Amino acid sequence: EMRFFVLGAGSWGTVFAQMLHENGEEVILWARRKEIVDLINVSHTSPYVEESKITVRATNDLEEIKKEDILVIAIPVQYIREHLLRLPVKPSMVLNLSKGIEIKTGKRVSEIVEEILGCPYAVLSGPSHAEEVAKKLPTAVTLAGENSKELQKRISTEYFRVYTCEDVVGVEIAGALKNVIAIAAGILDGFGGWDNAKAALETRGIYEIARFGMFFGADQKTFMGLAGIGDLMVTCNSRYSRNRRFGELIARGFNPLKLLESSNQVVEGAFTVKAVMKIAKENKIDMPISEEVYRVVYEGKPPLQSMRDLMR
Amino acid sequence: MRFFVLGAGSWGTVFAQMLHENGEEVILWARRKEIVDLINVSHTSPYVEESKITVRATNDLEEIKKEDILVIAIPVQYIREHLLRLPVKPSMVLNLSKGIEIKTGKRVSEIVEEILGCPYAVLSGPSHAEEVAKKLPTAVTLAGENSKELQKRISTEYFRVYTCEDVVGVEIAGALKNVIAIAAGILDGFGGWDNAKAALETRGIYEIARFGMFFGADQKTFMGLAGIGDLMVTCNSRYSRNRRFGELIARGFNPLKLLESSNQVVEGAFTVKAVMKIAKENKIDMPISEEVYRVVYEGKPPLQSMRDLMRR
Numbered sequence A: 001e002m003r004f005f006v007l008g009a010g011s012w013g014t015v016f017a018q019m020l021h022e023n024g025e026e027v028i029l030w031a032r033r034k035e036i037v038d039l040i041n042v043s044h045t046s047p048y049v050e051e052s053k054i055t056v057r058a059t060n061d062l063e064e065i066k067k068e069d070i071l072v073i074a075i076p077v078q079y080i081r082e083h084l085l086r087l088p089v090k091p092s093m094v095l096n097l098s099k100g101i102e103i104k105t106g107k108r109v110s111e112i113v114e115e116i117l118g119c120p121y122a123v124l125s126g127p128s129h130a131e132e133v134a135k136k137l138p139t140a141v142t143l144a145g146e147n148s149k150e151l152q153k154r155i156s157t158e159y160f161r162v163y164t165c166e167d168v169v170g171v172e173i174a175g176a177l178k179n180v181i182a183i184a185a186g187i188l189d190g191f192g193g194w195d196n197a198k199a200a201l202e203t204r205g206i207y208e209i210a211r212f213g214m215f216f217g218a219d220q221k222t223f224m225g226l227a228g229i230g231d232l233m234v235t236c237n238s239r240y241s242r243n244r245r246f247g248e249l250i251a252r253g254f255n256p257l258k259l260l261e262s263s264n265q266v267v268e269g270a271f272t273v274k275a276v277m278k279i280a281k282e283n284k285i286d287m288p289i290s291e292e293v294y295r296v297v298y299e300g301k302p303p304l305q306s307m308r309d310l311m312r
Numbered sequence B: 001m002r003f004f005v006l007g008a009g010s011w012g013t014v015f016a017q018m019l020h021e022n023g024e025e026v027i028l029w030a031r032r033k034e035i036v037d038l039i040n041v042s043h044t045s046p047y048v049e050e051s052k053i054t055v056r057a058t059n060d061l062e063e064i065k066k067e068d069i070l071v072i073a074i075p076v077q078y079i080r081e082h083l084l085r086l087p088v089k090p091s092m093v094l095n096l097s098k099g100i101e102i103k104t105g106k107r108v109s110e111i112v113e114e115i116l117g118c119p120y121a122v123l124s125g126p127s128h129a130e131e132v133a134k135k136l137p138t139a140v141t142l143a144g145e146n147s148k149e150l151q152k153r154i155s156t157e158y159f160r161v162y163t164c165e166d167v168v169g170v171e172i173a174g175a176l177k178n179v180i181a182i183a184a185g186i187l188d189g190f191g192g193w194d195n196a197k198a199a200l201e202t203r204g205i206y207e208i209a210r211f212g213m214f215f216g217a218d219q220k221t222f223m224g225l226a227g228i229g230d231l232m233v234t235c236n237s238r239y240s241r242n243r244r245f246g247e248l249i250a251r252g253f254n255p256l257k258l259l260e261s262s263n264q265v266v267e268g269a270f271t272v273k274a275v276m277k278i279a280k281e282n283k284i285d286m287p288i289s290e291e292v293y294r295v296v297y298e299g300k301p302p303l304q305s306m307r308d309l310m311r312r
């Protein structure tokens, strides 16, 4: 009946594809580079997944996608558009895994998909660090959108629980913006771990996020579930979070741009915050935390002056 | 208007000192003449590291006056036996303690109403005493009588007080977050299951809110500093005693020997029992609290408990 074409072989694309493959689903994983395809197919390893055998089949050919495929998007948001534009056919639907907002257009992934493919859309999002999912540690996420019931059945495992909801916009916005807050949370860790401060930041942060989402018609309840508060918590408080780590290193004195070029992994919040600021200015929505993360990341604002400013 | 701070543990001592350092008239009562003399003579306390305590200490409840603000900072199971010994009734109580009395099933507000019968406010939020002593950014909420006035006197540049109307919600949120934090700590003792913890905390805030709304709490309270904020700092911070307790039980230590190993009080250990009685009497379902009770009081293996809670 059905096949998953997983687009993007980073940490999460690879782990998700492998999980689906282990569920007994028909899966193929697309990787950008032939070297990654080769490592997966030949040596059943990926540099994106530590100590985990990768047995799912990889390809470098987009021409392998079929009109009956479920396209799973696991490409970092700023690179989704160029890759969808090169698909030789439209898939039967899109399941999005990526968290962010496209900088130039202010578009959520659903909207990019709508513009380019126009096929049914769903989004999976929750507290799900790929490192822990690969180790089969208990994880729960939410799924919103079309065909969510069937998708729930095929994706779920013993350790990976999928709850469905109806608020696509809310799920997309919560997952995108929690990375921005997490940067701000890492800064506090970079100061030494100011736990009272972080929890207060997280509290005000979920609220800032909910205000942005509700302005685009999200449901307030979405922000109090796994896609909102859950994901925010796992991201602000885990050693596995790239966004929290990015903030932590900025606080330690590392140059933000240099940090970005130091990894092959993407820090989505560094990009989303710029998209969020453009939207906020155009629609006159106040985003205090996002505005400070923007200043620290892009305008070289001293993290400590940022901290003090945000307090008043 | 004088603050009479009843109880010289970690938080009574720090709160008392902070008010004193901000120019308020304060006196601190300590149960033991040894602690009183350390504070008055050596300007130190074993409940507050590397920090000079200059606030005046007394061992005499006779020093309280009808014009005082009675600030309660005695762990909840021991408040009553001390309030019964007050020679006079204070103008009001500000309560700092987080829990529910086992003997009766009563909140601190209901203990104060029964024994003293004066006005009441509660201060609660993400405020680990260790960090407040170090003057690190901290935010809490205050509900109840004279909150506006108390806000003006208590607030510092690093200790921010927000007021709200919901005394019941604030008390239940602060009492019960400690029960969820034992559960959260257990996941740290298995090795750190971050995705699971986040899912636990998302379910946990909802279990807390359900219990509170049964007693006429406001839903919004649980999404603020008293609710999610305090839950987050307690589940995730190295300073949490309740998180540490759970971590140590997951590592195989005996719950009672853990409690006896320290002069500090693990309020969640006692609050869970009071919760269970209330829940059984009122047919309120409390999945997480129930498993915490079983692990702490009934020797239930933490891994079996984890497995069972997942089936709920």
Ligand SMILES: NC(=O)C1=CN([C@@H]2O[C@H](COP(=O)(O)OP(=O)(O)OC[C@H]3O[C@@H](n4cnc5c(N)ncnc54)[C@H](OP(=O)(O)O)[C@@H]3O)[C@@H](O)[C@H]2O)C=CC1
Pocket: A008, A009, A010, A011, A012, A013, A014, A032, A033, A036, A048, A074, A075, A076, A077, A079, A097, A098, A099, A100, A128, A129, A130, A131, A264, A265, A266, A267, A268
């Ligand atoms: N724990 C996690 O890692 C989680 C991630 N997510 C989300 O999944 C999405 C994908 O990120 P994730 O899987 O972590 O990716 P990683 O951070 O692990 O790696 C970044 C990926 O971007 C790829 N890429 C594709 N096209 C380009 C290009 N044009 N320029 C630069 N890089 C490109 C890289 O490929 P190459 O190897 O060829 O450089 C690599 O696969 C993100 O939106 C993320 O937020 C969601 C949940 C969990």
Ligand SMILES: NC(=O)C1=CN([C@@H]2O[C@H](COP(=O)(O)OP(=O)(O)OC[C@H]3O[C@@H](n4cnc5c(N)ncnc54)[C@H](OP(=O)(O)O)[C@@H]3O)[C@@H](O)[C@H]2O)C=CC1
Pocket: B007, B008, B009, B010, B011, B012, B013, B031, B032, B035, B047, B073, B074, B075, B076, B078, B081, B096, B097, B098, B099, B127, B128, B129, B130, B263, B264, B265, B266, B267
């Ligand atoms: N970071 C923190 O510690 C925070 C604590 N809280 C709350 O403050 C309240 C007070 O706890 P905290 O300051 O932490 O106390 P600690 O855990 O630091 O110490 C325990 C206290 O219990 C005292 N105690 C007083 N009377 C009795 C008695 N009747 N029988 C047995 N022990 C007694 C001990 O006195 P002695 O020294 O004589 O043994 C000691 O002062 C709690 O409800 C707690 O939840 C709130 C915010 C921050």
Ligand SMILES: O=C[C@@H](O)COP(=O)(O)O
Pocket: B098, B125, B126, B127, B128, B129, B178, B181, B230, B233, B234, B239, B240, B241, B242, B243, B267
């Ligand atoms: O705000 C956190 C305080 O209640 C301290 O928590 P704890 O008793 O678990 O140390």
Ligand SMILES: O=P(O)(O)OC[C@@H](O)CO
Pocket: A099, A126, A127, A128, A129, A130, A179, A182, A231, A234, A235, A240, A241, A242, A243, A244, A268
């Ligand atoms: O590593 P991060 O900060 O990209 O976070 C991964 C998350 O999306 C987990 O929910």
